[PDB]
Amino acid sequence: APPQPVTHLIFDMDGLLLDTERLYSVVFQEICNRYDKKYSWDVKSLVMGKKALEAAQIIIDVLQLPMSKEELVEESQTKLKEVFPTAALMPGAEKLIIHLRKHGIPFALATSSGSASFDMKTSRHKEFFSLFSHIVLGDDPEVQHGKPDPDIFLACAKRFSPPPAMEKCLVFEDAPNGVEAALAAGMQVVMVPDGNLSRDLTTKATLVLNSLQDFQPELFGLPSYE
Ligand SMILES: O=c1[nH]cc([C@@H]2O[C@H](CO)[C@@H](O)[C@H]2O)c(=O)[nH]1
Ligand SMILES: [Mg+2]
Numbered sequence: 001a002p003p004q005p006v007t008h009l010i011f012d013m014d015g016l017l018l019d020t021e022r023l024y025s026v027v028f029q030e031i032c033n034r035y036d037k038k039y040s041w042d043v044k045s046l047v048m049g050k051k052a053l054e055a056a057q058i059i060i061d062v063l064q065l066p067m068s069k070e071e072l073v074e075e076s077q078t079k080l081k082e083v084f085p086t087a088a089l090m091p092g093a094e095k096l097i098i099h100l101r102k103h104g105i106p107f108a109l110a111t112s113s114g115s116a117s118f119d120m121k122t123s124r125h126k127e128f129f130s131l132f133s134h135i136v137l138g139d140d141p142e143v144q145h146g147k148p149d150p151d152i153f154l155a156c157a158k159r160f161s162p163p164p165a166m167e168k169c170l171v172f173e174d175a176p177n178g179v180e181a182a183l184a185a186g187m188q189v190v191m192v193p194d195g196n197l198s199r200d201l202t203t204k205a206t207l208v209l210n211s212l213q214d215f216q217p218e219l220f221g222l223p224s225y226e
Pocket of ligand 1: 021024052053055113
């Protein structure tokens, strides 16, 4: 389906705006290794976009780890707290966000991350995160499940003033679960996947790019870059 114009943008955070997926990978690989299991791309593809407890349970079931989801979340979060503040902005993120703000294009953030995790990750990028119209987190009372449930994107769109039709919203995602949540919400979606993700998991989005740097806003009826 050819790209159609949009008026409101919704961004994922982890792996899309910030380089935090490699932080999760290292902590989960370290935990999995002690059980002689490999935290591989196949497993990672299943859990990006899930809430922390959801992700933990999947890791445990798929890799048959001898722990509870609460135990895996506690241990992993304890380790991640030391590195999350070092999160860096992904290529193209700043350019795109500043462009939208300048042309008055509303945009918002919809992340399955909880409050503390979000605070840590964005603690050193406050000027970037202040430009978003609003933020929905995974611990929001309105979000019952992580992506691919559309809850989080629907909640996000309904909080713009005035609220757009879902079909005029464009999601940006790095994860398959997030592309599926956007489609389930009735929204178009730009995917910027890691190249290690499978072909099957990277061929569902409206547009698939190697980098945010390659996004051409005019394809979606937005102002071109000056
Ligand atoms: O490798 C991983 N990446 C991401 C998550 C989860 O998804 C959210 C962001 O992708 C994050 O909050 C965590 O629950 C995970 O558990 N493991
Ligand atoms: Mg993501």
